[PDB]
């Protein structure tokens, strides 16, 4: 009913329940997932994925497997903006690294200049 | 009638005068409400239409098949319930304009 409210930071790491080692040791990475180059499509772009650093994955010697003692290793969080990404990573407690976004720079390609006269641009095959 | 199809509903014996004094109380408690709202308009409209249905009906089954809400006493039950929300809508000020907006990046779904 429009009460006393203070406008401060949050400390939700006490309430999310995950213990201290998995809170303060692993470091998040907020990145835009790069384009898988064997395809050419940037629909898989336009999101900010938060992931964690990988840790040890040994060989289970009975079947030849990959077991691990890592519950946080297989997360990914899809975000819409870097601002809410950093706000969430500072809300929930753990340390983090933020990279920036890289785009294809707009070029100026033209078939008519690919069939030039006195420039060295010449397709030599078509 | 005798012991209608519902279970937890003891039948009535004088439906008409009971329903009429219920709807007069509906119109009065609506009379408490300020005129400038639209809730007064729409509830006055629908309740006086139903009252005009009942004034042309001294029967029971023709009253149940001109007006919906089968069979009979659920109409009285929801009339009491609408009187209850009328009493609650003296409070709660719903005609007053909007409380503060969402931050406008929220309801856009496909994320």
């Amino acid at each position: 009913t429009q009460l006393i409210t203070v406008d401060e930071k949050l400390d939700i790491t006490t309430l999310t329940g995950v213990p201290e080692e998995h809170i303060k040791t692993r470091k998040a990475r907020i990145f835009v997932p790069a384009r898988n180059n064997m395809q050419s499509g940037v629909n898989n772009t336009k999101k900010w994925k938060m992931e964690f650093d990988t840790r040890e994955r040994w060989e289970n010697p009975l079947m030849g497997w990959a077991s691990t003692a890592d519950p946080l290793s297989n997360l990914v969080l899809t975000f819409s903006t870097k601002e809410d990404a950093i706000a969430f990573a500072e809300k929930n407690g753990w340390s983090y690294d933020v990279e920036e976004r890289k785009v294809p720079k707009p070029k100026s390609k033209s078939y008519g200049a690919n069939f030039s006269w006195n420039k060295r641009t010449r397709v030599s095959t078509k | 009638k005798k012991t209608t199809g519902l279970v937890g509903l003891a039948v009535c014996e004088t439906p008409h005068e009971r329903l009429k004094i219920l709807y007069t109380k509906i119109l009065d408690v609506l009379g408490h409400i300020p005129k400038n709202a639209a809730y007064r308009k729409y509830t006055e409209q629908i309740t006086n239409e139903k009252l005009s249905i009942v004034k042309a009906e001294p029967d029971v089954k023709k009253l149940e098949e001109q007006l919906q809400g089968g069979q009979i006493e659920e109409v009285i039950l929801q009339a009491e319930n609408e009187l209850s929300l009328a009493r609650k809508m003296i409070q709660w000020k719903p005609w007053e304009p909007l409380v503060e907006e969402p931050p406008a990046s929220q309801w856009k779904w496909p994320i």
């Binding site: 009913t1 006393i4 409210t5 006490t14 | -």
Partner: protein, 114 residues
């Protein structure tokens, strides 16, 4: 920037509720060690109770302190009844080591944890 608080206005009622909850947990323990037939003296149980209170001793948001009051009160209800069996009350303790130390050297011989 208007937020409805849970229970408290400032930290005064937060401190009052959390010391009330600590008083209840102090007078609640010997009933549990008499009822569930535990294997641990009263001193060690009270020391880990005050350890768990002292672990989160630096949170100043009153909403969060009220919500931890609600958490501790739910666990106090479910331990003052006979619902939570011997396994959960022993699960609060850590006697199944896990002796994993916090050196650098012993963390180096069992590596990949800097």
């Amino acid at each position: 920037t208007s937020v409805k608080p849970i229970f408290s206005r400032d930290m005064n009622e937060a401190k009052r509720r959390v010391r009330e909850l600590y008083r209840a947990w102090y007078r609640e323990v010997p009933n549990t060690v008499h009822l569930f037939q535990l294997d641990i003296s009263v001193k060690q149980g009270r020391d880990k109770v005050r350890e768990m209170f002292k672990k989160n001793a630096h949170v100043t948001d009153p909403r969060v302190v009220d919500l931890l009051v609600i958490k501790g009160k739910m666990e106090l209800e479910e331990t003052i009844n006979v619902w939570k069996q011997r396994t959960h009350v022993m699960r609060f303790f850590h006697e199944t080591e896990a002796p994993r130390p916090k050196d650098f050297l012993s963390k180096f011989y069992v590596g990949h944890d800097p």
